[PDB]
Amino acid sequence: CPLMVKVLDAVRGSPAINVAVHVFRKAADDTWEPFASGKTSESGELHGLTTEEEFVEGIYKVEIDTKSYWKALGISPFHEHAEVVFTANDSGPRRYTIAALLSPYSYSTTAVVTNP
Amino acid sequence: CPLMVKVLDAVRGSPAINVAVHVFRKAADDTWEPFASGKTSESGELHGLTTEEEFVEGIYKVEIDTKSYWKALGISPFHEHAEVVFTANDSGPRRYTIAALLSPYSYSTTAVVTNP
Amino acid sequence: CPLMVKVLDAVRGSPAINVAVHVFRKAADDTWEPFASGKTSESGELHGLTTEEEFVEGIYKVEIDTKSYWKALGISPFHEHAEVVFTANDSGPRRYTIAALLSPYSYSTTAVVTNP
Amino acid sequence: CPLMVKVLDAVRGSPAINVAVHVFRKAADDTWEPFASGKTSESGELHGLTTEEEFVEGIYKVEIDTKSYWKALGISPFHEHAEVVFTANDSGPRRYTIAALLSPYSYSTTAVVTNP
Structure with a gap:
């Protein structure tokens, strides 16, 4: 998996x-072209977005719909979404984990990058 | 001052x-139209972005050029920039503080919304 | 004011x-001997803990009673409290700001060390 | 695994x-009695600290030696260590993941708690 997303709820x-x-x-x-989409599973993970062949050098944006998540729990949050923007694979193919930790008025995002 | 930005370096x-x-x-x-800009001061703060008159309800994006900041320190960073997207809502008097805590592979952002 | 504490609520x-x-x-x-204490103000800050005279080099622990805070809001929290342990070092004039960002199952803490 | 620790480097x-x-x-x-100890693996994880039979109701403290980690990389960090203190298993056995995200002057810690 060259690109994986993991989302945690801090509340x-x-x-x-x-x-x-x-x-x-x-x-x-x-312009921003659609690349892939999906929903997190019961473990808060999203796998299988792409393949190594398709995931070429470029600037990518990962947009996480945090607003819909909080509204479904009855909480009115601050942010519209969380966006992560980064250059990928410019010194060769790597594997990327994008993790987000969510609270209604705050989030953090971390990348873990490994060389396969 | 209904909108202020504070940026901290975690390294x-x-x-x-x-x-x-x-x-x-x-x-x-x-589409996104430019609204205000500046550079953070010695205390990491940016004041005087707008006034109560001009700051009407709407959707706003705050973009922080994190990549240039790390490059000046000689540290290679992950993100192209940090983006914060939110709705401003009239619901009593509101002041918004958007804070960001920066590391090379991670950032967090928090909104503090108070009423004088 | 060589030591100040700021506490924010991310929910x-x-x-x-x-x-x-x-x-x-x-x-x-x-062993740990009591040194100073207080309750955060309306702006979430605690000032006047100590003076430059008394704040000598050494190891300090700052304990924040997070559990009582969440219990007052009716939210069940994970941690018993938040603890920050650090060495104060004379290395030019130093002011220490210890900030904590609280969620029920997560907290972050950051130190901002500046020189007037 | 009733208790697992995961540690990430944000630099x-x-x-x-x-x-x-x-x-x-x-x-x-x-008083604080020693319960278990270990070192994180190449994936930043520490497994096998305890068993369900041994991990009874109580107040536990997880101490992460962040200072030694940063010093070995040539960075002088702020904190002596990161401590996480929590009541475990008081409404029956659960599984606990304690995650920490480290920077030299900041850390965050999150708990993920699941019912087996």
Whole structure:
């Protein structure tokens, strides 16, 4: 898995389940092209977004729909979504884990990058 | 001062000085129009971005140029920038503090919303 | 003011008000002796803990009673309290800001060390 | 595994490897008794600290030696260690993951608690 997303809920101390995630890649004409999408599983993870062959050098954006997650729990949150933007694979193929920790008025995001 | 930004450096335990910040407002055509910008001061803060008159309800994006900050320190960072997207809502008098805590592979952002 | 504490609530996007803080200094017998204490103000800050005269080099512990704070809101929390342990070192003039960002199952703490 | 610890490095974007961890349990006489210890693996994880039979109700402290980790990388950090203190199993047996994200002047810690 070259790209995996993991989302945790800091209010409940649990994985964040059924969170929508959209990934985009910056195209030649400086616009964001849809690349992949999915929802987190019961473990708060999203696997299988892409393959090593498809995941070429580029600037990518991972957008996590945090607002819908909190609203479904009855909480009105601050952010519209969480976005993570990064250059990938520019010194060769790597594996990327993007982790997000969510609270209604705060989030953090961390990347773990490994060389296969 | 209804909107202020504070940026901290988690590697050095210091304010993040001279970081570029751009603020955008979402226009009816669903694109981002420039709204305000500046560089953080010696205390890592950016004040005087807008006034109560101009800061109407709407969707705002705050973009922090984190990549330039780490590159000046000689540290290779993960993210292209840090983006915070939120709705401003009239619901009594509101002041918004957007704080960001920066590491090379991780950031957190928190909103503090108070009423004078 | 060489030592100050700031506490934020990530669930409500507000200062964490009326939180008990205790400060201890490590004594030569390797036990913790009380040093200073207080409750955070309306802005979530605690000032006036000590003076430059008394704040000598040594190992200090700052204990934040997070559990009582969440229990007052009716939220069941994970941690018994939040503890920050550090060495104060004379190395030019130093002011220490210890910040904590609280969620029910997660906290972060950051030190900002500046020189007037 | 009733108790697992995972440690990440926010400066390098990698797991934090060979980090010493000590766990204690509060004894009848209000002192901290040693319970288990170990070091994180190449994946930044520490498994096998305890069993369900041994992991009874109590107040536990997980101490992570962050200072030694940073010093070995040539960085002088702020904190002496990171401590996580919590009541475990008081409403029946659960599984606990304690995660820590480390920077030299900041850390965060999150608990994920599941019902087996």
